[PDB]
From a paper:
To address this fundamental question and overcome the dynamic and transient nature of substrate translocation, we tethered a substrate molecule covalently to specific residues along the putative translocation pathway of Pgp and utilized cryoEM to capture Pgp structures with bound substrate during various stages of transport. In conjunction with molecular dynamics simulations, our structures trace the substrate passage across the membrane and identify conformational changes in transmembrane helix 1 (TM1) as regulators of substrate transport.
Four single-Cys mutants of Pgp (Pgp335, Pgp978, Pgp971, and Pgp302) were generated for crosslinking, and mutations were chosen near the two previously reported QZ-Ala binding sites. Based on the appearance of the yellow DNPT byproduct, Pgp335 and Pgp978 reacted with AAC-DNPT within minutes, while Pgp971 and Pgp302 did not. Importantly, Pgp335 and Pgp978 retain notably higher ATPase activity after crosslinking than the respective apo-Pgp mutants in the absence of substrate, suggesting that tethered AAC still acts as a substrate and that Pgp335 and Pgp978 cycle between IF and OF conformations. The non-crosslinked molecule is bound in a position that resembles the one previously reported in a crystal structure. It interacts closely with the covalently linked substrate, which is situated further up the membrane. Both ligand molecules are oriented along the vertical axis of the protein and positioned side-by-side through hydrophobic interactions.
Author numbering: 32 to 616, 689 to 1260
C-alpha cells in the first residue's frame, strides 16, 4: 500500500538540484549547533583558566592581572567572531535549505496535481461506475496536500535532525568519550519511561472513552426520542440515568488525569537525575585532573542535543509515511491505461459517411452489477436517413444501446459498424464528435450561454454559431430575460427551468452538426406546457440526419416512421404496432464566568501553591547549575571541590524529587477539580436540554449528532480553561518573575540587555506563526476556488465525455491552478526568510549576551558565575516558559469556544417548561374547544399553515380528523400538549385557558400515541411503567394494561417481562406488537383523553384487527381523538365528525361523499 522513492519520479533536473542543495544546507545547519556547543565549552575553559586568581602573591602585584585580562579580551573577541560567523552561516544556510526544499515540493505538487487531473479525466466511464465520485474528489483535494506537506517540510527537516544527531555524537566521542558513554547509558531510560507512561495513559483513555460511551448510548437515545420524552413528561428518570452512568466516567477520568500528571512528574524527575549523574561523573573527572569544565559542558550538551534530535525526528517520518500512503493511490490512478483513450491520434479518417448502423449479437452487462446480465444479443440493421424508435419499459435498463453507441462501454462478443467498419478502429474523438447525444436531464455548467453553446464543438465565428442557435425556440427565451448575451446560467444565479434547459442542450447538440443523433427521454417528468415545442425542434433537427429515439411518450412514437420497440432484451420487428399494447394511462467568554462555574474554591489553593513551587524550582535549578560551573571556573581551595560537587549533585536529586512530588500533588488536585467540573457540566447541560422545548429541538441547527458531540467531546474541554490554564499561568509567573528578580539582583546590566533582546525573538516567532497561518488560509482559499471547477467537471463526467470537449476542462484547470502555483512559491520564500531570521536572531542574541558578559568580566564587575547565572536564568527560563505553554490543552480554542457554547446552552431561556407557575384543577371534564386558532411552525414560518379551524370535543367522543402527515400538517395533536406555543388562537379545556394550567398536569392527562413508537433499551415491564412517570409506580397494573391492550398472548413467551429488554434488537418486537405495547404504555397512565395515529400499521395486514380492537376498547372506555390517513379505520370509527379546515362538522356520508374514495 506504499511506494518508496518513486514520488520523485516526476522531478526534473532543476528539482533534483534543488533537493541536493537543500540536503547539503540541512546537513550544514544541523552540524552548526554542536559547533556552537564546542565554542561554548572552549569559552568556559578560557574563563576558568583566566579567572582562577588563586595566587594571592600576584593578586595585587602588577595591578592584579591587567596583562592577561587582555588575553581574555582577545580570546573573547575571536570567540564573538566565531559566534557571529556561525550565525551568518546559519542565516544563509537555513534559507537555502527551507526555500529550496519548498520550491521543489511546490513544483512537484503542481505537476502531480495537473497530470493527476489529466489522468482522471482520461479513464473510461466504467471505472467511474465502479468507483465513487465524492470520495474521489476529496481524494484529489486531500492526498495532494498530504504529499505537499510531507515531501516539502518534513523531508526538509529530517536531514537537519540526522545531521545534528551525527554532529553531536561525533563531538561527544571526540572530546569526552568517558562521559559520553555514561550519558549514553542514562539516555534510553527517559525514552522508556515516556513510552510506558504514554501506554498507560492511552489504555486509561480508551477505557474511559468506552465507559462514557456506555452513557452516550442513552444520551443519544433520549435525544432522538425527544418528542416522546417531552410528551410523556418523565425527564427526571433520564437525568437520573445519565448521572448514574457518568458516575463511572468521572472516576475513570480521575485515573486518566492522575496518570498524565504523574507522567509529566516522572519526565521531570528523570531529566533532573540525569543532570545530577552527568555533573557528578563530570566533577569527579575534573577533580581527577582529566577533563576540564569546558570539556564536560561541551560533551554533555552535545550528547543531550543529539539524543533530543534523534528523538525529535519522529513527525518528519510519520508525515513521510502518510505522504507515501496517499501517493500510492494517486500514482495508481495515473499510469492506468484505459481501454478507450479518447486522446490517441490513431484511427482511420472516413469522410462523406452515410451512417448505416448495425448490431449483431450484442451481449453486455453493467460492470457495476456484473452478476445481472442486461443485454443478451441483438440483430438489427438500419439505412441512412431513416429514424428508428424503440418502445418499452427501458432501453435495456436505461438506454443501453445509447450508452454503447459512443464507446462509453465495451461490448462483449458483439460487433457494430457504422459503415461496415467496427467502431474499435475509428478514432474515439472523431466518433464522439460525429454522434449527437442529448441527456434525459440536461446538466449545464456555471457559465454563460455563449460558452455553453461554445462547448458544442470548436467555438467558431460567433455570428456563425449564433446562426446555428437560430433554430426553433430561440429569439424569445434567449434575449428577453437572458439580456441577449452573458446569461451565466447555473444552479447558483440566473437559474432557469427544465423546459429551457432541454432546448439549450438541443441547440448545443445541433452546434456540433452530428451525423447520427440519439434521443433519450426528451420530456422525462417535464411539464406538458413546455411540450409541443421541444418536439417540434427535435423533429426539425430530425429531418436532416438519421436518429434513434427512445422515449416513454407516444407522440414521438407516432411521429417516427420505423419502430423496433421491445423489452426484456428480446428484439421485436420494426414498422408495425402488432401485439404492442398501448394503454393511454459566539462571543468569547470573560473567563471569570468559568471560574464562578467551578465553584469548588478548595482543590485550587493546593494546586496554586504546587504550581508556584514548580515554577520557582527552575530558577533554583539555574542557580545550582551556575554554582556548579563556578566551582571550577571561579575556583578556590582544591580540597573543597569534592564536598561542593557532592552537595550540588545531591541538590539536583532533591530538586528532582521535590518537583516530582509537586506534580503528584498538583496533578491530583487539578485533575480532581477538572473531572468534577466536567461531570457537573455534563449533568447541568443535560438538565437544561431536557428542560428545553420542542421548538428548540426542532431547530435544524441543533442536529442531534452535533448536539451529542457538543455534550460529549465539548463538555470535557472546559477542563482546559479553569484547570491547566490556571496552573500554567501561575507556573510561568513563578518561573519568569523569580528568574528576573535574581538576575536584577546580580547582573542587572546583562539582565536588562537580555530582557530587551528576548522579546524581539519572541515577537518574531509570534509574527512568523501569524503570517504562516494567514498564508495557509489564503492558499486554501484559492485551492477551493480551483476545487469548485474540479468538482463541477467531475460530477458531470458522463455529459462532458459524451461531448468531445475534454482538453478544454484540463486547460481551464491549469489556468485556475496557475495562480496557486505562484502563491506557493511566494509563501515558500517568505517562510524561508522568516525561519532564517528567527534562527539568526537566536544565535546573534547568544553571541551578544556573551560578548557583553566578557566585557563586564574584563571590567571586573561580575564574575563568570554571575554572568552564567543571569544568562541561564533569562534565556533558559524563557525557553522553559515556552515549553510549559506548549504543553497545555489549548486555552485559545477547543476550550474557549466550547466553554462559551455550553454556557449559552446552560443559560438558555425556559420556554413554557416545567415550573411552579401552574394551575392544577382537581376536576377534568375532558372537553376541549379547539376553534379560532391559527399557527405556523417556528422552524419554517415561511409556509403558513393551520388556518381556520373550529373543533368541539365532548365526553365519549371519537373525533376523527384528516390532516397531512407529510410535513405534519395535522399538528393539532402536537399543540394539545404544548409542544409549540400558539401565537393568536386560544385553546380552552373545560372552560379554562391552558396558559394558566400547569404544564406537567396537562401532559399527565394526554395519552398520546406517535406514528413510529420509538423504543429505549429499558425492559418491557419498566417501559410500560414509563406511563406513570412522576407518579406512583408499582406492579399488577402493568398486567392489567397488558390485558387491556391484548398483549398477554404474545408476552406469554418469556413471561418474566423483567429481563426482556429490546437491547441490541434482542427480544425483537415486530411493528404490530410494538404498536400494541405503545397503546399499552399510553393506557397504563390512565389518562382521561387519548390521541392516536396509525400510518404503517396497515402494512402489517394481520395485526390491524388486533390493534383496531384495542383502540375500540380504549375509546369505549374513554374519550379518544383520532387522526389518520387510513379511511378504513375511520370507516370503523363510529362517534366521529370529519373536519377539514372547519368545512365539515358531521359524517362524510351525511354530506357530499368527498370523504369517501
Ligand atoms: C517534558 C518536557 N521536556 C521537554 O520538552 C524537553 C526537551 S529537552 C529537555 N527538556 C532538556 C533535557 S534533554 S532529555 C535527555 C536527557 C539526557 C540524555 N542523555 O543523553 O543522557 C538525553 C536526553 N534527550 O533525549 O535529549 N531539559 C533541560 O535541559 C532542562 C533543565 S530544567 C528543565 N528542563 C525543566 C525541568 N523542564 C521544563 O521546564 C519543561 C517544560 S516541558 C518539558 N520540560
Ligand atoms: C557558497 C555560497 C557562499 C555561494 C552561494 C552561490 C548560490 C547563489 C548558487 C549555488 C547553486 C545555484 C544555483 C544553482 C542552479 C539554479 C537553478 C535555476 O532554476 C531556474 O531555472 C529558474 C530560472 C527562473 O528564475 O526563471 C535558478 C538558480 C539556481 C537555483 C542557482 C542559484 C544560485 C545558486 C543557489
Ligand atoms: C546573493 C547570493 C550570491 C547568495 C545568497 C543566495 C540565495 C540567498 C539566493 C540568491 C539567488 C537566489 C535565486 C535567484 C533566482 C531564483 C529563481 C526563482 O524561481 C523562479 O522564478 C522559478 C523557479 C522554478 O520554478 O523552477 C526563485 C528561486 C531562485 C533559484 C533563487 C533562490 C535563492 C537564491 C539562490
Ligand atoms: C536517572 C537514573 C536512571 C539514574 C540516576 C542516578 C542518580 C539518582 C544518582 C547517580 C549517582 C548519585 C550520586 C553519587 C554520590 C553522591 C554523593 C553523596 O552525597 C554526599 O553528601 C556524600 C559525600 C561523601 O561522603 O563523599 C550521596 C549523594 C550523591 C550526590 C548521589 C546522588 C544521586 C546520584 C546522582
Ligand atoms: C522586580 C521584579 C520582581 C520584576 C518582576 C517582573 C514581573 C512583574 C513580570 C516580568 C515578566 C512577566 C511575565 C512575562 C510573560 C508572561 C506571559 C504569560 O505567560 C504565558 O506563557 C501565557 C500564555 C497564555 O496564557 O497564552 C503569563 C504571565 C507572564 C509569565 C509574565 C508574568 C509577570 C512577569 C514575570
Ligand atoms: C537582523 C537580525 C538577524 C539581527 C542582526 C544583528 C547582528 C548584525 C548583530 C547583533 C549583535 C552583534 C554582535 C554584538 C557584539 C559584537 C562585538 C563587537 O566588537 C568586536 O568584535 C570588535 C570589532 C573591531 O573593532 O575590530 C562587534 C562584533 C559583534 C560580534 C557583533 C556582530 C554583529 C551582531 C551579531
Ligand atoms: S539538552 C538538549 C538541548 N539543550 C540545550 O541546548 C541547552 C544548553 S544549556 C541548557 N540547555 C541549560 C542547562 N538548560 C536550561 O536551563 C533549561 C531550563 S528549561 C529547558 N532548558 C527546556 C525544557 N529545554 C528544552 O526544551 C530543550 C530542547 S533541546 C535542548 N533543551
Amino acid at each position: 500500500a506504499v511506494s518508496v522513492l518513486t514520488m520523485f519520479r516526476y522531478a526534473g533536473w532543476l528539482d533534483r538540484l534543488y533537493m541536493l542543495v537543500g540536503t547539503l544546507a540541512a546537513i550544514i545547519h544541523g552540524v552548526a549547533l554542536p559547533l556552537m556547543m564546542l565554542i561554548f565549552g572552549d569559552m568556559t575553559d578560557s574563563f576558568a583558566s583566566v579567572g582562577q586568581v588563586s595566587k594571592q602573591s600576584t593578586q595585587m602585584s602588577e595591578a592584579d592581572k591587567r596583562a592577561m585580562f587582555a588575553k581574555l579580551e582577545e580570546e573573547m573577541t575571536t570567540y564573538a567572531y566565531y559566534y557571529t560567523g556561525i550565525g551568518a552561516g546559519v542565516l544563509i544556510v537555513a534559507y537555502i535549505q527551507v526555500s529550496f526544499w519548498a520550491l521543489a515540493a511546490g513544483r512537484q505538487i503542481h505537476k502531480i496535481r495537473q497530470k493527476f487531473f489529466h489522468a482522471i479525466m482520461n479513464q473510461e466511464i466504467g471505472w467511474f461506475d465502479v468507483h465513487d465520485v465524492g470520495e474521489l474528489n476529496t481524494r484529489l483535494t486531500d492526498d495532494v496536500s498530504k504529499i505537499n506537506e510531507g515531501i516539502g517540510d518534513k523531508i526538509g527537516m529530517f536531514f537537519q535532525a540526522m545531521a545534528t544527531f551525527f554532529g553531536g555524537f561525533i563531538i561527544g566521542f571526540t572530546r569526552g568519550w568517558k562521559l559520553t558513554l555514561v550519558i549514553l547509558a542514562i539516555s534510553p531510560v527517559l525514552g522508556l519511561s515516556a513510552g510506558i507512561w504514554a501506554k498507560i495513559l492511552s489504555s486509561f483513555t480508551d477505557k474511559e472513552l468506552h465507559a462514557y460511551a456506555k452513557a452516550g448510548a442513552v444520551a443519544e437515545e433520549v435525544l432522538a426520542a425527544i418528542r416522546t420524552v417531552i410528551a410523556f413528561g418523565g425527564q427526571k428518570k433520564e437525568l437520573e440515568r445519565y448521572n448514574n452512568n457518568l458516575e463511572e466516567a468521572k472516576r475513570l477520568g480521575i485515573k486518566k488525569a492522575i496518570t498524565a500528571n504523574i507522567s509529566m512528574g516522572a519526565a521531570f524527575l528523570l531529566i533532573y537525575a540525569s543532570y545530577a549523574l552527568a555533573f557528578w561523573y563530570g566533577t569527579s573527572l575534573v577533580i581527577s585532573k582529566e577533563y576540564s569544565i569546558g570539556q564536560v559542558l561541551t560533551v554533555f550538551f552535545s550528547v543531550c542535543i543529539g539524543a533530543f534530535s534523534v528523538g525529535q525526528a519522529s513527525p518528519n517520518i510519520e508525515a513521510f509515511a502518510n505522504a507515501r500512503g496517499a501517493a500510492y493511490e494517486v500514482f495508481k490512478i495515473i499510469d492506468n491505461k484505459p481501454s478507450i483513450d479518447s486522446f490517441s491520434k490513431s484511427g482511420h479518417k472516413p469522410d462523406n459517411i452515410q451512417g448505416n448502423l448495425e448490431f449483431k449479437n450484442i451481449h453486455f452487462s453493467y460492470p457495476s452489477r456484473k452478476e445481472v446480465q442486461i443485454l443478451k444479443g441483438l440483430n438489427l440493421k438500419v439505412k441512412s436517413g431513416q429514424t428508428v424508435a424503440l418502445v418499452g419499459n427501458s432501453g435495456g435498463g436505461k438506454s443501453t444501446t445509447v450508452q454503447l453507441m459512443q464507446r462509453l462501454y465495451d461490448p462483449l462478443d458483439g460487433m457494430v459498424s457504422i459503415d461496415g467498419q467496427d467502431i474499435r478502429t475509428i478514432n474515439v474523438r472523431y466518433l464522439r464528435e460525429i454522434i449527437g447525444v442529448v441527456s434525459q436531464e440536461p446538466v449545464l455548467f456555471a457559465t454563460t450561454i455563449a460558452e455553453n453553446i461554445r462547448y458544442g464543438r470548436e467555438d467558431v465565428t460567433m455570428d456563425e454559431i449564433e446562426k446555428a442557435v437560430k433554430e426553433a425556440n430561440a429569439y424569445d427565451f434567449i434575449m428577453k430575460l437572458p439580456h441577449q448575451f452573458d446569461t451565466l446560467v447555473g444552479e447558483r444565479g440566473a437559474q432557469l427551468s427544465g423546459g429551457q434547459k432541454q432546448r439549450i442542450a438541443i441547440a448545443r447538440a445541433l452546434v456540433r452538426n452530428p451525423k447520427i443523433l440519439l434521443l433519450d427521454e426528451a420530456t422525462s417528468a417535464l411539464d406538458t406546457e413546455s411540450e409541443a415545442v421541444v418536439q417540434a425542434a427535435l423533429d426539425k433537427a430530425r429531418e436532416g440526419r438519421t436518429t434513434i429515439v427512445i422515449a416513454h411518450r407516444l407522440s414521438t412514437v407516432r411521429n417516427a416512421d420505423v419502430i423496433a420497440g421491445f423489452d426484456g432484451g428480446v428484439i421485436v420487428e420494426q414498422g408495425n404496432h402488432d401485439e404492442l399494447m398501448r394503454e393511454k394511462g459566539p462571543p468569547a467568554s470573560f473567563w471569570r464566568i468559568l471560574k464562578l462555574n467551578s465553584t469548588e474554591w478548595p482543590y485550587f489553593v493546593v494546586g496554586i501553591f504546587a504550581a508556584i513551587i514548580n515554577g520557582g524550582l527552575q530558577p533554583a535549578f539555574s542557580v545550582i547549575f551556575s554554582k556548579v560551573v563556578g566551582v571550577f571556573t571561579n575556583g578556590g581551595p582544591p580540597e573543597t571541590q569534592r564536598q561542593n560537587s557532592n552537595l550540588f549533585s545531591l541538590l539536583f536529586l532533591i530538586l528532582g524529587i521535590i518537583s516530582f512530588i509537586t506534580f503528584f500533588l498538583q496533578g491530583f488536585t487539578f485533575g480532581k477539580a477538572g473531572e468534577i467540573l466536567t461531570k457537573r457540566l455534563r449533568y447541568m447541560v443535560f438538565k437544561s436540554m431536557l428542560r428545553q422545548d420542542v421548538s428548540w429541538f426542532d431547530d435544524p441547527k441543533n442536529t442531534t449528532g452535533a448536539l451529542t458531540t457538543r455534550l460529549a467531546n465539548d463538555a470535557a474541554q472546559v477542563k482546559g480553561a479553569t484547570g491547566s490554564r490556571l496552573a500554567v499561568i501561575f507556573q510561568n509567573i513563578a518561573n519568569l518573575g523569580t528568574g528576573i528578580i535574581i538576575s536584577l539582583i546580580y547582573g542587572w546590566q546583562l539582565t536588562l540587555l537580555l530582557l530587551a533582546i528576548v522579546p524581539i525573538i519572541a515577537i518574531a516567532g509570534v509574527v512568523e506563526m501569524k503570517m504562516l497561518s494567514g498564508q495557509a488560509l489564503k492558499d486554501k482559499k484559492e485551492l477551493e476556488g480551483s476545487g469548485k471547477i474540479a468538482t463541477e467537471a467531475i460530477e458531470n463526467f458522463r455529459t462532458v465525455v459524451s461531448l468531445t470537449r475534454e482538453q478544454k476542462f484540463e486547460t481551464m484547470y491549469a489556468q485556475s491552478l496557475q495562480i496557486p502555483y505562484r502563491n506557493a512559491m511566494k509563501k515558500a520564500h517568505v517562510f524561508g526568510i522568516t525561519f532564517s531570521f528567527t534562527q539568526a536572531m537566536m544565535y546573534f542574541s547568544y553571541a551578544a549576551a556573551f560578548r557583553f558578559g566578557a566585557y563586564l568580566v574584563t571590567q571586573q564587575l561580575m564574575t563568570f558565575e554571575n554572568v552564567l547565572l543571569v544568562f541561564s536564568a533569562i534565556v533558559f527560563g524563557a525557553m522553559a516558559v515556552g515549553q510549559v505553554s506548549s504543553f497545555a490543552p489549548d486555552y485559545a480554542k477547543a476550550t474557549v469556544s466550547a466553554s462559551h457554547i455550553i454556557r449559552i446552552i446552560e443559560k438558555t431561556p425556559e420556554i413554557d417548561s416545567y415550573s411552579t407557575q401552574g394551575l392544577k384543577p382537581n376536576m377534568l371534564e375532558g372537553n376541549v374547544q379547539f376553534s379560532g386558532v391559527v399557527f405556523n411552525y417556528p422552524t419554517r414560518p415561511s409556509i403558513p399553515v393551520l388556518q381556520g379551524l373550529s373543533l368541539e370535543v365532548k365526553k365519549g367522543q371519537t373525533l376523527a380528523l384528516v390532516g397531512s402527515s407529510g410535513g405534519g400538517k395535522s399538528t393539532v395533536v402536537q399543540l394539545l400538549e404544548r409542544f409549540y406555543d400558539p401565537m393568536a388562537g386560544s385553546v380552552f379545556l373545560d372552560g379554562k385557558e391552558i396558559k394558566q394550567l400547569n404544564v406537567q398536569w396537562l401532559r399527565a392527562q394526554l395519552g398520546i400515541v406517535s406514528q413510529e413508537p420509538i423504543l429505549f433499551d429499558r425492559s418491557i415491564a419498566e417501559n410500560i411503567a414509563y406511563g406513570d412517570n412522576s407518579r406512583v409506580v408499582s406492579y399488577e397494573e402493568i398486567v392489567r394494561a397488558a390485558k387491556e391492550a391484548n398483549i398477554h398472548q404474545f408476552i406469554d413467551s418469556l413471561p418474566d417481562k423483567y429481563n426482556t429488554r429490546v437491547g441490541d434488537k434482542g427480544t425483537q418486537l415486530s411493528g404490530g406488537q410494538k404498536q400494541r405495547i405503545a397503546i399499552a404504555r399510553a393506557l397504563v397512565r390512565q389518562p382521561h383523553i387519548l390521541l392516536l395515529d396509525e400510518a404503517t400499521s396497515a402494512l402489517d395486514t394481520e395485526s390491524e384487527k388486533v390493534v383496531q380492537e384495542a383502540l375500540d376498547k380504549a375509546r369505549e372506555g374513554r374519550t379518544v381523538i383520532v387522526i389518520a390517513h387510513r379511511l378504513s379505520t375511520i370507516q370503523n370509527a363510529d362517534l366521529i365528525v370529519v373536519i377539514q379546515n372547519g368545512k365539515v362538522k358531521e359524517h362524510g356520508t351525511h354530506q357530499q361523499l368527498l370523504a369517501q374514495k
